[PDB]
Symmetry: C3
Subunit: 200 residues, 3 copies
Amino acid sequence: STPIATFVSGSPSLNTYNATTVNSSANAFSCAYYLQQWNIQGLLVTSLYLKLDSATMGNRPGDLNSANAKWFTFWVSAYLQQCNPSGIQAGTVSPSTATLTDFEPMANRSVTSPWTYSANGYYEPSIGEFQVFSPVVTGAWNPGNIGIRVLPVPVSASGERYTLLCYSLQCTNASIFNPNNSGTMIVGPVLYSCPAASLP
Amino acid sequence: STPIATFVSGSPSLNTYNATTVNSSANAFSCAYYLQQWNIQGLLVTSLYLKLDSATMGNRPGDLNSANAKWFTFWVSAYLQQCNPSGIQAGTVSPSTATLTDFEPMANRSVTSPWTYSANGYYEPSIGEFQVFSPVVTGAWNPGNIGIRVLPVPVSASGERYTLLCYSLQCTNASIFNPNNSGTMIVGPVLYSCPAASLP
Amino acid sequence: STPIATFVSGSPSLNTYNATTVNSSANAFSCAYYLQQWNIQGLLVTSLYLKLDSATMGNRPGDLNSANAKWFTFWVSAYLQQCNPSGIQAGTVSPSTATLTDFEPMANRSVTSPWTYSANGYYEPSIGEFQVFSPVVTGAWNPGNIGIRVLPVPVSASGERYTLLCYSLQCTNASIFNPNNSGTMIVGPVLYSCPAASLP
């Protein structure tokens, strides 16, 4: 077969806000992303950009707890109909014979108990690799450094198990979820490699 | 030739404890691992899981020094007979014409003086890249975050030089080497890329 | 076409000091490097070693500000004539039909305003991924840990835009730019992956 498959999805301009992220106060928001993936003979390499904008993200509750939220979770999925909590969009696979199941991560060998899938449930991974990024911010958003916990996570839905890539983005400062602050934030490219579930 | 070679070794369940790790108090232990490697046109990509279990690791000396140990070293080798201090097991290479020498890292250009190979010697690398992981832990094991120093290291044995991949796993808290504490710990997948010594 | 292209440049021994780095006090220095790159079906993987040596780097101003400098910037470019602030040398591309434009990074989706290219200008990136290395040091050089900010950066020159890979190396301690201290420092291999601008 083909030794290498690729997948590209999302908004190249980061100006289309068609995905979803849930923060630690269980508030759901619209976000933009750009996703580029490779399956290189069973190695899954994933590049991701994420953007939030006060003007497109949605209502930000006031209440101290909500306004002081710092963490939010984003999910990259290869199961766009069956287990897609962050609403990854249909994209382009190369070559033409590849399919999105070429982009499922191999199960995480450190984790057994799965997350029960919700459309708006907040999942906070406390295990796995930790990366640090400085974000690109505009306006009155001042999150500071963004820590990123990233790992393959087993997710249960309707008696089926899926492994998804989970990103917990962890602001240094409360800022971006406070409705009194307008602004934007972009982080990336966040790179993550792991074994793929199959060969392309 | 083939542009891409792969190697897989170890325990998929992490329930077979056939490798070896030495900690900073020079105490040797049995551990489980799962190793997946790629040589992509001379780029070596390595994925590793590691597991320790109080019930299989071996005797844990008491003595303050031993019980308060936090660091341990694991070695990934492509020289399973000649220079294999952590006891990587025979595995599966793809394609059929590839050999394990396809998985030797290129020499580290920052290091000249080699480590003198021992079957039970403790080597503590103080140079190189540093990654941080949160482990998956059970029972009364509470190591906290695991720092990971990882790099290709030159190793001497019987007038021959080998480059191996060295991992120093560095617990935040003394816990796992204290014989009064039962538990387990899994870390991974730890990803590391470096130039390969050759093309596959 | 070829799914995989490679590029190799610089000094394998790190003993040829033909590249350039500018530090935070705007002092320019000669340095050695070794650069190995892959374009794997549009994924750009870059391995870099960097070396400074008091005996080859050039004049180190005294003046408190200069001597206490800790950060310096290195640029990897695929535009060796048009936009090459660190003086990457001509190298070897494989296969024979590949060219250096196969190694241009895709534009950074988080950054719009470019850096105005200088031959000796200091650029300090404050956004992007952050890695940590322990360096290999000799003599009276004691920089401690080296933080590394690394990202693709848009650069303007003569009405043309280029994306280059920018590395900000950030010493923990003032040491290496103090003319009273002789020594050397090597860091690497620093690995960085990002999307490539094109397929090879």
